[PDB]
Amino acid sequence: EVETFAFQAEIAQLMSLIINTFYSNKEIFLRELISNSSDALDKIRYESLTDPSKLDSGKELHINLIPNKQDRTLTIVDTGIGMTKADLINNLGTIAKSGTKAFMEALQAGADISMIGQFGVGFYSAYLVAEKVTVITKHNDDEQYAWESSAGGSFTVRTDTGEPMGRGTKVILHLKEDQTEYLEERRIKEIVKKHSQFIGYPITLFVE
Ligand SMILES: CC(C)c1cc(-c2noc(NC(=O)C3CC3)c2-c2ccc(CN3CCOCC3)cc2)c(O)cc1O
């Protein structure tokens, strides 16, 4: 059973802007996703300070970057707190309506797309490079779910029957045909070094 939902209008508008605006500095998507993973990792770590059993679903806190040139996907995996079904539906655990409004207002005033993270909606920068994004997630005591959208105003949510994750979130970027540079080891390394040097969890770049 797959449920299909409409994005709030403001979010659909932001996604369209991201997809259709000319902007060459697309590499910022990766910093935003790694930042999100870091925040989710902070949260499970904090909760584990008073309830160690929350780590029964996995003690290692890290981020993996997995390029697949055959499938044309870049996958970012973390072992953070994970999202519930409600989190996914409610704009991936974010106050995206108010964030997206302010961001589009700032862009009107002369801000640039790279500042998206300041408005709490950095996730949507994924659409700079991806034609479709799948988010697979698992929170303690809830089921594993898959969220997916190719923009166009809607997203789906379903119970995921793929490889079980202990706990955390996997973001699978199905890259646009002209954005395969983000599957190359040296390019990814460059971006991580430039934008994510002070992330406090191990980031492992898989090779093929
Ligand atoms: C799909 C995006 C949004 C995403 C979410 C999570 C995640 N898993 O559990 C979570 N649940 C959370 O509560 C974690 C934040 C602690 C999150 C999460 C949700 C929203 C944000 C965006 N923030 C939200 C607030 O404003 C700044 C950006 C970051 C991570 C993640 O680990 C990686 C990601 O790329």
CATH class: Alpha Beta
- The proportion of residues in beta strands is 15-25%
**Distance between the terminal alpha carbons, to the nearest Å?**
34 Å
What Rg, in angstroms, do the CA atoms define?
Answer: 16 Å
The CATH architecture classification is: 2-Layer Sandwich
The total of helices stands at: 5
Number of domains: 1
Judged by helices, strands and strand pairing, the structural class is: alpha+beta
Ligands and ions found: the ligand CC(C)c1cc(-c2noc(NC(=O)C3CC3)c2-c2ccc(CN3CCOCC3)cc2)c(O)cc1O
* CATH topology-level fold name: Heat Shock Protein 90
What strand order characterises the main sheet? 1-6-5-4-7-3-2-8
User: In one word, what is the shape?
Assistant: globular
Under CATH, the homologous superfamily reads: Histidine kinase-like ATPase, C-terminal domain
Number of beta strands? 8
The ordered H/E elements are EHHEEHHEEEEHE
Largest sheet: 8 strands, mixed
Helical fraction: 25-40%
Modified residues (N6-acetyllysine): 43, 69
Subcellular location: Nucleus; Cytoplasm; Melanosome; Cell membrane
Family: Belongs to the heat shock protein 90 family.
Protein name: Heat shock protein HSP 90-alpha
Characterization of this structure:
- The structure is a monomer.
- By secondary structure, the protein is α+β, with helices and mostly antiparallel strands.
- It has one domain: Histidine kinase-like ATPase, C-terminal domain (Heat Shock Protein 90).
- Helices cover 30% and strands 23% of the residues.
- The chain has 5 helices and 8 strands; from the N terminus they run E-H-H-E-E-H-H-E-E-E-E-H-E.
- The protein has an 8-stranded mixed β-sheet.
- A hairpin with a 4-residue loop joins strand 5 and strand 6.
- The radius of gyration is 16 Å and the shape is globular.
- The termini are far apart.
- It binds the ligand CC(C)c1cc(-c2noc(NC(=O)C3CC3)c2-c2ccc(CN3CCOCC3)cc2)c(O)cc1O.
- The site of the ligand CC(C)c1cc(-c2noc(NC(=O)C3CC3)c2-c2ccc(CN3CCOCC3)cc2)c(O)cc1O has 20 residues, from helix 2, strand 4 and strand 7.
- It is classed as chaperone.
